[PDB]
Design a protein around this ligand. Structure first.
Ligand SMILES: NC(=[NH2+])NCCC[C@H](N)C(=O)O
Ligand SMILES: NC(=[NH2+])NCCC[C@H](N)C(=O)O
Ligand SMILES: NC(=[NH2+])NCCC[C@H](N)C(=O)O
Ligand SMILES: NC(=[NH2+])NCCC[C@H](N)C(=O)O
Ligand SMILES: NC(=[NH2+])NCCC[C@H](N)C(=O)O
Ligand SMILES: NC(=[NH2+])NCCC[C@H](N)C(=O)O
Ligand SMILES: NC(=[NH2+])NCCC[C@H](N)C(=O)O
Ligand SMILES: NC(=[NH2+])NCCC[C@H](N)C(=O)O
Ligand SMILES: NC(=[NH2+])NCCC[C@H](N)C(=O)O
Ligand SMILES: NC(=[NH2+])NCCC[C@H](N)C(=O)O
Ligand SMILES: NC(=[NH2+])NCCC[C@H](N)C(=O)O
Ligand SMILES: NC(=[NH2+])NCCC[C@H](N)C(=O)O
Ligand SMILES: [Mn+2]
Ligand SMILES: [Mn+2]
Ligand SMILES: [Mn+2]
Ligand SMILES: [Mn+2]
Ligand SMILES: [Mn+2]
Ligand SMILES: [Mn+2]
Lengths: 298, 298, 298, 298, 298, 298
């Protein structure tokens, strides 16, 4: 299926500047060339216009920092993504902090009976203004997409929820806030923390994830945060957490997903050139995209 | 069970200075705060007074360097540990070189009918003055505790042996002197070298270890030497050996032990701030203690 | 004098992508905050719109790569800069590759009888299509400003030359093409290569430079390329050359310039976040700007 | 079986200078002492004389760089190796780029009815002048030994082919040219790329490899290219590819081979001191040789 | 003159733990052997007992963190130092944060009519509770010794001030708070910031410093903070500031002081093993002490 | 004057293996191409055959390790060098440990009435079997050439001494054994240790050196040991000593020598690829040769 790339230069979901340079860092890491080689009809729809944040003290949210600008940028993204899907193309969203997942899922979910989600990440991203310890919206996209959070976030695209808890699989988690542990536990979300990855191995984790979703969804969205990889492999992220997934485990994951042919949309986020070492993180993302989209060693 | 921390600023078991700073390096890495967060009644009983070495020339044996100071400090440690156990508290000993294991086991073992031991280490520590290639007592604590070695060491606490060979499990070993291989083989001590870790995987090694001990001991003492981890993960040790256990394998091990609820005493040793990089090793030790004591990602 | 910042996201002057992210990397390194603290009336006029390059094979220049887009972007910059000067403000241009110096000098020079230039750089940037070994325009701005090169470049702003050879001082040079050595020699341009910096010392080099220009110009433009600093101090540049000026020599230079009060316009260029280590180079630039604009240790 | 070491200071199989220093870098890393310690009768037959290449423009094929010199040096190697085998000794060849495998296999194969080969490498080394993207002969030894390529290479030792496709096992591959993928696929060569190693685990890949070959060969030659290991473990190679085999996986592999007792000849190649960090790569090779030849941790 | 070493395991002058390990890190870096080699009668009087701080909320001033404990420990130090001077020995104090200078100067100054001070540091350490931006007493010792600050600090040893402004020389300064710049300016304290060191050169700064003090004091105390050196040379400090003095400049400084024979007491402070790389900073301090005490290359 | 390169793969003057790879490490760093570019008639006469060391036990002196092999290789070198000089060519010797200086000076000195020597090094190399703390001949070449030492070394080439003490200038020294300090002092050899370099500056040291020699010699031999540079700039040496000459000071020195036109022979020694980082040291040596032989930045 033809691919359409949409860059979302978003950093309002968190406080570290530079993550808005992620889309172009990845473009410069050769994302187009990489995919063209796989003989794909690849189109780059450019970047979503992101607005600026007003004085924190002058406006609305500390438990929900930059809510208006984040909700507006996400409305735009949701529309762009909805259109690509309508054109029968695969939407490949390049971030940008994880708050953009709200817009991506808003544009995709409407097109599926039961959209599944694989959240490849070191965190849960299931906080609400009530549970968030930072007020950073990039830590709330999954919860918001499940229909939990501020209506400005849960209603993007004009509907909610975008997905169901039983159709979500978290992989690589190693940092959850107490409220999130409760959320995950209570909503019954399938989660493979680093304990399970270490204990079962990435092959088994992926086999189970693929079988679980394939068995109950009609589409699967891959939401990959580079912080899911160990900081030694992906240093250019704002919220690094040691003891993460390796470069190889990640390529294996992408290769098994490609093999399964279940991924119908994807986004690579949190690439921050300014916290990186010579674009290493953007390069890992592009390599991972190569695997996801069909590259084979043999 | 409430925890009592006992620091043992010992460096007389070997020749590299600085390992006596281990206890405070770990305190500075936040060992108390870390454990308090797990809702533990944690108490820090301070440090065991360690004496200074006698004239190297007038000293008893080059095969048993600093024997008297080491045996004396170990008598004190054994008494302090014995008391904690008698008070119904879990003794958490922070070293200090591995020779302090002699004192820790002397204070604990008397309270169990069949105390088991998990020796997480890159070496065997089962040398005697006859087999030791260095004369360093930190390479003899396991043998001494099994009743093999100089009486000044084997009789600490007034009894011997502290444990039986069939109740010991070595994990992560990758450097054994010939006499130690003979000792292990002949005493029939269960051992998982890096070959078995690489071949079987940490999960299986831990499962087997836990089941083996759970099946025949009434208490288990964890004796963890930071040199058991790869020098890239724990550079601050006096006897580093490449090709070691990773950060994740070590957390998995601690998590599986926590889950099993078999650890009744523990000690983290050989942290040397002076051979380290910004307290990285003390930090790893504290993180490992967090997993051992119940932290869960989910 | 009030400062007006103009970002020029230019990378068409050379081939390494990412240098177009320099303006924002510096903004993120805190350029505004830094200058505001010096109690300056600082204004950020945003970025100059840069056009895209057409197929190399489809258009005009290999000895003059991206000539049209480079000349057009420079016309825009020249206008923006001209306006700031007319408003009686100091133009502070943030790049972007060095080809933007063509536009900056085009906007400034018209306002001075004898504008002097200090070219802080590892190279000479005095090539023409005839002498250029790469066809990269970022290696021709000085020559073009002196009136030597393609008319599309020498006539920006509608006049030429912008400056005279006798009013130019090169500092930190350690890589000159043969044609450039001839150019410098023949035009009689004052140059302090690393040999002179090593031999005389930065204090003497700066004293002489300041006295030389102060004695014959009515304004001095500082054109600072980060590659002038050693790659160990400023790794984020496309054309690094070892054995460069140190962090301290650079701050000394800026401090002596501030003291002299001869700098009437300035530009910091070649900052490339994508070839950098955690924004180190953008940070050095901002620190250097702090010194240039008056910061004092005492 | 006694061992005879043969150094082959070859760099003509590729373009990076320095790989000719590999034999001595390994000698300096202690290859002799390491093996003597295992109680081996070890003999160092010195180095095979390598000639200098003729003028490239006067050379016969650009798709076959340095063909004459490489074929010549290979004839000499084949003779020396043939002799060692005839003397009832194990030939241990130290390189030198991988093109020397042509000579090693030429001297060995003639002595076996069905010689098996384990190609521990990141590449396939199955190119021909037609498929080679570089013209570097170090990327053609496996194909040449299988009887595919220039006769100057396929006829070394006066016979062909040296081995059959069904007796070859590639391990650690992560970089194959299209022509090579077709070659491997069509010749039906057993291959375990990083996908399989990641998916199945080294233990299983080795068990299967050993069982497969043991079941159909009368001798097995190990041709180990240090680039098979991750560049972080073995940086001193001319063709590094990230996402490689770890230090531990490699020792496990060697240990399982030693255990199986199937290796009848071996060669360690591509060590380049000039692209290395303090002889790290030569040291790894020597340590792997120690495992291959019988070292045991327990 | 015989030397008496006094360790002061102090970290209460600031907030980073570990600087209390400085005295022993330097002992382990070989301070005694180094000095014995210079044929000195060296004596190690051990460490000054430091108390623990009282509850912050129950403390008297947040602008003066740990005031009681710091003042107490300083009284003890002053007494020990006073005693060494009375015995006709040179007091060599090892820290420990810079707040200990209050105690060192208190024990020394009383023995001189006009004690001079050389403050080798990146900061001024001339803050008061009013000007301090942190409330950390390690940033107030110079002012306190000059008689400016809380009486608990200014009256240590029972007298004040210990020294006069005209007898103080600051070298290597590159970080002064506004209040401190005003203080230095108004008290007329001689200061050589990095600008002067860069501009004049270390040789000239030292010649002038030595001549200035030699001309008006009857004793000179060297108070050397390792943060005065660049963080690349001395990473183990709590308040690092880039663009510092080099390893060579520091040895030159010590060598010129030794040559001048004006140093009558000294202290090396802020060494923090826990923020260091393999005891590098403690080693630098010891090497500098070797130069200060007479080592000569020729 | 045409240049003739003579490689001397010598490591018998010391104990660390690998320095014998120095000549080719430098050839691989492009020494020929570098000099050809300067329009030199450059000829590479290959390498001097070096013999293997005798049984350590049956060897002549532990105070003169490998004396016979070292003296023999030096006889050969002296002859090869003597010939080059007789052919009117400049002898450029590449080492190899510093003991080869004995042979280089033996072949050159006979052709001058008063040959001067510039010993660019971190050590003095003026030990004898009596003063040597190691027995390593690479620490005795200067003394031997001055006629002090074992006759097997002092009589190479059949005459002695090769040079006079008043015609020698040591630069960069920072490590002298006591006997060497006495030797230097008593023979009245001109020496600029790091103290003088730090105090006077490289420019002044070079000016003085050049004038001193120019005023009394008819030829000057440059004997440059890479250990003269700081280990951070030249890590690939067997006897590194911190606090050395920088990359720039070394280029300045070479440039001033080139300018003076006094160097009539030269040798670059102690490059050890095996203790280096990606051939960095050989690269520095080649760059230095480029400056020595006339390269100019301007
Ligand atoms: N997309 C991310 N990087 N999320 C990190 C979230 C961290 C933390 N749970 C928070 O809510 O602040
Ligand atoms: N299997 C693992 N890698 N576990 C990591 C656990 C780390 C630590 N105990 C935490 O809770 O953050
Ligand atoms: N606890 C330790 N670090 N032990 C290291 C022992 C090393 C060696 N086996 C010895 O006996 O000397
Ligand atoms: N499975 C492993 N990691 N084995 C490591 C063995 C290394 C080497 N053969 C030794 O005996 O030291
Ligand atoms: N602004 C620059 N970085 N210029 C580098 C120019 C390098 C070289 N002289 C060229 O013309 O290609
Ligand atoms: N004084 C200096 N740093 N000179 C550097 C010269 C480097 C080299 N000879 C060149 O021409 O590029
Ligand atoms: N032995 C090697 N390093 N081979 C690398 C081969 C790389 C590539 N397949 C080629 O044929 O050029
Ligand atoms: N299992 C793995 N590690 N696979 C790595 C594949 C990397 C990438 N897709 C390639 O073809 O180069
Ligand atoms: N001894 C020191 N490290 N002093 C640092 C002082 C920093 C700052 N001027 C303060 O008063 O907080
Ligand atoms: N000569 C120097 N190195 N000056 C450094 C000054 C740095 C900067 N202007 C500051 O005030 O922090
Ligand atoms: N060329 C050298 N690297 N010489 C080092 C000499 C070191 C010491 N002075 C010795 O005589 O052993
Ligand atoms: N000016 C210098 N850099 N001197 C370095 C001297 C270092 C030390 N005192 C020694 O004798 O080794
Ligand atoms: Mn996320
Ligand atoms: Mn141990
Ligand atoms: Mn430039
Ligand atoms: Mn290969
Ligand atoms: Mn201070
Ligand atoms: Mn030397």
């Amino acid at each position: 299926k033809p691919i359409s790339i949409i860059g979302v230069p978003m950093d309002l979901g968190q406080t570290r500047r530079g993550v808005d340079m992620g889309p172009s860092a990845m473009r410069y890491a050769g994302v187009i060339e990489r995919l063209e080689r796989l003989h794909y009809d690849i189109e780059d729809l450019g970047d979503i216009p992101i607005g600026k944040a007003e004085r924190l003290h002058e406006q609305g949210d500390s438990r929900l920092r930059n809510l208006k600008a984040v909700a507006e940028a996400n409305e735009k993204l949701a529309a762009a993504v909805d259109q690509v899907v309508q054109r029968g193309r695969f939407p490949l969203v390049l971030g940008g902090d994880h708050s953009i997942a709200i817009g991506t899922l808003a544009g995709v979910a409407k097109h599926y009976e039961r959209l599944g989600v694989i959240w490849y990440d070191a965190h849960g991203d299931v906080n609400t203004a009530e549970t968030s310890p930072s007020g950073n919206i990039h830590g709330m996209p999954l919860a918001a997409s499940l229909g939990f959070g501020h209506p400005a976030l849960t209603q993007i695209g004009g509907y909610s929820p975008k997905i169901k808890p039983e159709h979500v699989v978290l992989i690589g988690v190693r940092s959850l806030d107490e409220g999130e542990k409760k959320f995950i536990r209570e909503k019954g979300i399938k989660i493979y923390t680093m304990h399970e990855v270490d204990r079962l191995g990435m092959t088994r984790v992926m086999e189970e994830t693929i079988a679980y979703l394939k068995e109950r969804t009609d589409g699967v969205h891959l939401s990959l945060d580079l912080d899911g990889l160990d900081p030694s492999d992906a240093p250019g992220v704002g919220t690094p957490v040691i003891g993460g997934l390796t470069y190889r485990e990640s390529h294996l994951a992408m290769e098994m997903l490609a093999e399964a042919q279940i991924i119908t949309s994807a986004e690579f986020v949190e690439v921050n050139p300014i916290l990186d070492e010579r674009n290493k993180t953007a390069s890992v993302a592009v390599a991972l995209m190569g695997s996801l989209f069909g590259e084979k060693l043999m």
